[PDB]
Design a protein around this ligand. Structure first.
Ligand SMILES: *[C@@H]1O[C@H](CO)[C@@H](O[C@@H]2O[C@H](CO)[C@@H](O)[C@H](O)[C@H]2NC(C)=O)[C@H](O)[C@H]1NC(C)=O
Lengths: 49, 48
């Protein structure tokens, strides 16, 4: 889809999930935007180390 | 006819998606949205 979906600065409208707790189940769809905790710390608000 | 539907999901609080199943006076409606459900959800009627 080179022709249609690529923009010179970048077509950043195509989002994908990069961080969550466990894998999803077959044909599950997850729409959560909530922050992922990568450390042993709990994490809150909007952003964290 | 006092039971008119069910709610299903994870958080049930618009943080995430959930399912609404209702049978109203007129049709069965089934819908799946990030609902902010009413804390006591229900339906009701004018009689005769
Ligand atoms: C569906 O949602 C439930 C609840 O949000 C998920 O289970 C949670 O998973 C995390 C990570 O293992 C735990 O910290 C919670 O305590 C779990 N809670 C419950 C009620 O299970 C479950 O993994 C989700 N399923 C899928 C396929 O994503």
């Amino acid at each position: 889809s080179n022709n249609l979906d690529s923009k010179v600065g970048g077509n950043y409208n195509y989002l994908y999930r990069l961080f969550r707790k466990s894998n999803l189940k077959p044909f599950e769809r997850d729409i959560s935007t909530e922050i992922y905790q990568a450390g042993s710390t709990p994490c809150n608000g909007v952003k964290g180390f | 006819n006092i039971i008119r539907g069910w709610i299903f999901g994870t958080t049930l609080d618009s943080k995430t998606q959930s399912l609404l199943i209702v049978n109203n006076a007129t049709n069965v409606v089934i819908k799946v949205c990030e609902f902010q459900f009413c804390n006591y959800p229900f339906l009701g009627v004018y009689y005769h």
